[PDB]
Design an enzyme around this catalytic site. Structure first.
Site, short mmCIF file in Angstrom:
data_model
loop_
_atom_site.label_atom_id
_atom_site.label_comp_id
_atom_site.label_asym_id
_atom_site.label_seq_id
_atom_site.Cartn_x
_atom_site.Cartn_y
_atom_site.Cartn_z
N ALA A 80 59.38 34.65 61.93
CA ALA A 80 60.10 34.98 62.82
C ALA A 80 59.75 34.16 64.20
CB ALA A 80 59.75 36.47 63.39
N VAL A 81 60.70 34.03 65.22
CA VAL A 81 60.41 32.90 66.33
C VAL A 81 60.92 33.95 67.79
CG1 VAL A 81 61.35 31.10 67.82
CG2 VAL A 81 60.82 30.72 65.21
N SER A 115 67.51 35.56 55.67
CA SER A 115 68.10 36.24 56.72
C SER A 115 69.36 35.56 57.04
CB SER A 115 67.31 36.30 57.97
OG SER A 115 67.27 35.03 58.65
N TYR A 120 67.53 27.40 55.54
CA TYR A 120 66.42 27.02 54.79
C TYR A 120 66.60 25.90 53.72
CZ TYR A 120 63.55 30.48 56.71
OH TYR A 120 62.96 31.48 57.45
N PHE A 396 61.25 40.22 49.42
CA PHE A 396 60.16 39.97 50.12
C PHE A 396 60.13 39.29 51.40
CE2 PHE A 396 60.28 36.66 47.03
CZ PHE A 396 59.74 35.77 47.80
#
Ligand SMILES: Clc1cccc(COc2ccccc2CNCc2cccnc2)c1
Ligand SMILES: Clc1cccc(COc2ccccc2CNCc2cccnc2)c1
Ligand SMILES: Clc1cccc(COc2ccccc2CNCc2cccnc2)c1
Ligand SMILES: Clc1cccc(COc2ccccc2CNCc2cccnc2)c1
Lengths: 396, 396, 396, 396
Positions: A80-81, A115, A120, A396
């Protein structure tokens, strides 16, 4: 802006960023179980200075690949950012640090669930499994004359309370995950979480039931709002007979209009029915993403199709080396070379080929992998194909 | 209730039953063009006595199968049973008569598009191509750095009026249909119909535009009600460069939010984008259905994958004979035998394998084909696979 | 603001007000046919001074009431008030003038279809028929073992083009309208309009088909937007066998998911099916409204139930007189009296009782009719009931 | 597969099957209250061998029929078949055993609420009450000048908390259920359940309020999601004045756009308004289903309409005997005969006639009851009609 392994004191800042980043994260109890899977040094935080503005970690997983080979796998998660710290290269810095630690630790592959689809690929992750939602209008569903378990007499399937048959579910899943590419070892703490989510929630999910066969189970719950929809959260069958017997029982849910499941593109369900069209693909998306960390270790570890004759080529991965690749008798040898490349591709593309979910020919037509030999393409397609359809274990 | 070839006097009764059975059938002009493709004796009618209560016919088509082999194909079409004459075995009687005529005439295969999924399996038709609708949110769409035709300078694609480039479209389609399994010869009268449907309709479809490349075209029209949706009716590309160049132009439709197309499962489009997920599978369904009329003629006619070594087996089709099947060097020999069957399946199952859209392993797991040899299954899967992804030409 | 019979010069102002008041009014051709039914002096206009700001008229109709008695009926229609001239008592003035002309001309009843439910009660019109929409999910529909016409052999029903069987439709409807309360004579000019509306419209309604039995017809068309919905515009059956045979044919529309019809509350359709619930009431509304113009002429004209023994009472209609009412042997005598009223009600309430669509007991419980005798209520309920269920012929 | 009365040890297996079969069944506490109404031997279970794969039971109820006669009634409830044990004749076997026990025990009628419309007709149950949902757009609603309780001064209706006026609700309901066909005795344990469901639920139903009149109550709650909809769960009025006074109060819910209620087809509500159309029928369905267990006991127990003169006929119920039926002075005598039948029908059809919800004429037109005498049909229609409209008490 420092990047550090977190101390115990960093975890409340991490739980706040988690709660603000993921709608599923209820609170600290949400990370307790998962967190037993994070090794020492498996986590990084970015602090402003101080407060947590960025985090990422990896879990120790076991991933089954074609040939029933199980690899140690670094599962990237909890990434997370802070919404205040966007566009400051924080995700890039966190992924470069974890990838260094994962490579130094000796993992041949990393994996994640994305997400979003656009993030990625640039860090070397390729989508490697495909989620396929089937919705069955069970009111029209009739089993084909050929379908297993049509005989009169006792049903091999029982309707049971999930929490009372934990041992059977565990044993069936352990057999399933060892035989299917995409399979993950599910540790005790994740069975604890799964069984907790099976209970009714005050103004949340309805109670989960199980259908239990000696060689398969389905865990299903009625939709919270659509009371004619049953959603099958999980269906693990080790034999074709178990898969058919479980679907006969699910189609016996006479209260329901529709049964939905997130499955894989090769689910035989449609072929069990006299009308294949009753099994509507209502949703398709990437599942597990792979980053090949060590190209030769990964290419030598998996099994290849026995039906393609021995062949040799030279594969270059864009920032990942050049290799003499020889595939025969279902095994690869993959050794350093400076000989001219016959095939080139980025790291993510190899991840997308690795479990057999994507054909080399399909990626070549998009120019994601380049070769001037059409015969070599057909040979790669055939060799990287998986005998057993790749499936997705659990997010996960 | 007689079953007869129709006379000229039967066609008005047939056009009335057509209008009442198919929403697309505007009137007699709707059947004019198609009807030049029906041979003498290609049509049956059922009369009450008299009026037309049942009809069916076949058209003379040319179907491309793996190995770029073109088969004479009987295309079943215009099949209707009056709503007054349901459940009287009229469809069974009409299909048995046409199948006798098709077999006696020497067609190795019949084909159709199914109004419903539960009707044609019992007459030996298996679904053989898969329609896959992709909807692109073109506002987020960016082409991957690897995608062809990213260079500055003139575009190879032109926006044109369909009716002014009929010759180019014809030539590109003729090349496409000869190289792709599922390809159909499109006769002049069907190009006349296609170009007529490209004009705006008073309170109907909007005007069609074309994007034209030397090696591909797309024909697209804005949705009649959703003015931010462009629907690509047809996209035929002979090279990867043409496919990419056409999609760059379609993603340049800046007025639109969404581009939808009915394509095949191996469309490389998603891989052209930095976010593969922008290419949402919004719909999936059977396309062309096949009935193998002559098992040995069909199995010997198609090409097989060169990557599987020579093997021999014994295949029984449930009411279609037993055969010694030997596959090597991309060719099959398929000869009568009374030796014990190693593989069994119904006729429809063979149709579903024939173009490579369905794996033998997937049908085996549903028990639609039976064998006690897992090695033989992998060999069939590999041998029946198509190098070139199977596509759907045009409905009939 | 004058109120006058219109001259030929007033009709263009009337067609403009019509076009602005009714979405169905395309133009002058819309009123041509209907207008042959308007007698001399059947129309009033209100002018500003001059332009037409108000209009209303009546048509000469024939209405069937219980006992198969046909009454001359004034059908109020084409009633509009300019949006510029609201709240100026124009509707009241037009209705008082037409009611004077209708009464002086000797009509015993007036009738209309109401654009809204709150307007016509105060002018003495009561809702007298009930529209009931049934939607059948025909995919589950199976006929009960008891249902007529289940035998094997020729169907008594034919699928036909409406315009080619005008004579048969006319004859069947004429028999239907004479036997059913609510029946209207349909003149030749309304059969011309009905057959014109059966053709496809450029960007409008789809083509209409007919199902034809010796003793009934259905006219149906697929919905313009919902292509799985067939709407039955009209279904007229003179026998139970014809009604069942027509519904077997409509449920044989295998293209469709749903068949909808606007019928009456006593339609036996649901009872023809093994699942009565498949016949969903999707919509209910008032149909024909009645104003009793002459109380004694109307009460003596209709037939009454033979099953109630002779009884006498005194009925007062609020501004419509007081009457000695004697009902026996299915006949009423209704004569002037100043004796004390045993029953009181407004004019609209009598209209709502008159065809048997509403029970006296139901209106009494709402206090719309007042009596201190519960026995008298049961006797009125029984006497005004119609042996044959009241239906709605066609809107005007 | 044994069929047995359950032991205390069977009830956990029964609660699991219940939870999986009915979305409303929260857990064991859901069956506690209802279960005090099940007599000894009122329940059957089917075991595999062992686990519960089938269950059914009956409760001891008291049902009001026309003439204000109260019958002992066996209420079939809690009927479920495991989704694993479909199509094994388990429902047939359970219904045959309970029907034997119900008949031997001396119940003249059984009753149920059907999950689906196609199941219970074949076991002799006919739909006998009709649920009618009315939705009022209360923003336009104005009471007719004739409507009771329009006078200035104190309101006879109070807004109250349900749990504080349990005694008044009980007394009003007891009077209501004794005067209305369809009425059920509501025991103390069902008043406990009703008052518990009146409280707000954490993420469930909103709090219930009551409107209380000396001669009626309404219990209503705002919809959980549509905050402009008030749903009236129950409205029991013993007088017309109470019914009107309660609807004036409900139409005084100025926060709401819409008031919905499940009522019966003869609800006078629409007639209370100046616009009857504001009372939209939004939903219609079967309510209570009846099986006549003893034809002569049931036919002699109910009261008949006094307005039809004495008549005699011969009624055959398809597997239920043939009877000389004489009806006069509101009473029937129904005695064994072998004389020729004048009327025939299945058991379910008699159940559908029994409370007056369905006319004999309507069932005859569907051929569900057969007679060659139209006079006899009119006499049956008139005789079986109920003076007081049949209503539905509460589901079970
Ligand atoms: Cl300390 C730690 C380590 C690894 C994973 C976690 C938990 O992450 C959660 C938990 C709940 C909701 C959302 C997330 C994050 N999205 C990925 C995910 C993970 C687990 C289950 N479903 C989805 C905590
Ligand atoms: Cl004499 C003849 C021979 C063969 C085909 C026909 C035309 O059939 C039509 C035409 C228009 C709408 C619908 C249909 C039937 N559905 C299949 C179909 C066919 C063609 C195009 N799209 C769909 C007429
Ligand atoms: Cl000169 C005259 C006399 C009497 C009726 C008319 C036509 O009125 C029309 C025509 C078309 C649409 C709407 C209306 C008015 N709404 C009632 C209605 C009437 C006929 C058919 N459907 C509905 C014209
Ligand atoms: Cl031991 C026993 C005996 C008789 C009834 C029951 C309870 O059954 C329930 C309870 C809750 C939800 C659903 C059901 C079953 N559906 C019918 C029904 C019954 C009661 C209330 N609403 C509906 C238990």
């Amino acid at each position: 802006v420092t990047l550090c392994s977190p101390t115990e004191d960093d975890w409340p800042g991490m739980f706040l960023l988690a709660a603000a980043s993921f709608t599923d994260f209820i609170g600290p109890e949400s990370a307790t179980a998962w967190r037993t899977l994070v090794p020492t040094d498996g986590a990084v935080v970015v602090r402003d200075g101080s407060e947590v503005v960025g985090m990422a970690l990896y879990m120790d997983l076991r991933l089954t690949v074609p040939g029933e080979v199980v690899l140690p796998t670094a599962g990237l998660s909890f990434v997370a950012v802070a919404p205040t710290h966007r566009r400051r290269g924080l995700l890039r810095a966190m992924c470069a640090e974890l990838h260094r630690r994962i490579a130094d630790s000796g993992y041949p592959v990393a994996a994640l669930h994305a997400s979003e689809g656009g993030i990625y690929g640039r860090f070397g992750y390729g989508p490697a499994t495909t989620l396929h939602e089937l919705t069955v209008d069970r009111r029209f569903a009739r089993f084909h004359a050929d379908a297993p378990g049509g005989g009169l007499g006792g049903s091999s399937v029982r309707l049971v309370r999930p929490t009372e048959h934990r041992g059977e579910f565990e044993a069936i899943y352990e057999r399933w995950r060892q035989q299917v590419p995409g399979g993950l070892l599910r540790p005790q703490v994740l069975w604890d979480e799964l069984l907790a989510e099976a209970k009714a929630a005050p103004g949340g999910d309805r109670e989960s039931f199980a259908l239990l066969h000696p060689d398969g189970y389905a865990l299903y719950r009625v939709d919270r709002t659509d009371l004619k929809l049953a959603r099958v959260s999980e269906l693990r069958a080790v034999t074709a007979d178990a898969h058919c017997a479980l679907w006969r029982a699910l189609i016996g849910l006479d209260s329901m209009e529709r049964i939905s499941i997130i499955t894989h593109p090769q689910d035989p369900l449609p072929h069990l029915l006299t009308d294949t069209r009753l099994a509507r693909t209502t949703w398709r998306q990437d599942g597990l993403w792979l980053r090949i960390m060590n190209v030769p270790a990964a290419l030598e570890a998996r099994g290849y199709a026995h039906e393609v004759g021995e062949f040799s080529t030279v594969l270059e991965v864009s920032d990942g080396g050049r290799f003499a690749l020889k595939i025969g008798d279902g095994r690869a040898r993959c050794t350093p070379t400076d000989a001219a490349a016959e095939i080139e591709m980025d790291r993510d593309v190899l991840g997308s080929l690795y479990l057999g979910a994507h054909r080399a020919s399909t990626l070549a037509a998009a120019n994601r992998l380049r070769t001037k030999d059409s015969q070599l393409l057909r040979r790669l397609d055939a060799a990287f194909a998986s005998d057993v359809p790749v499936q997705t274990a659990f997010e996960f």
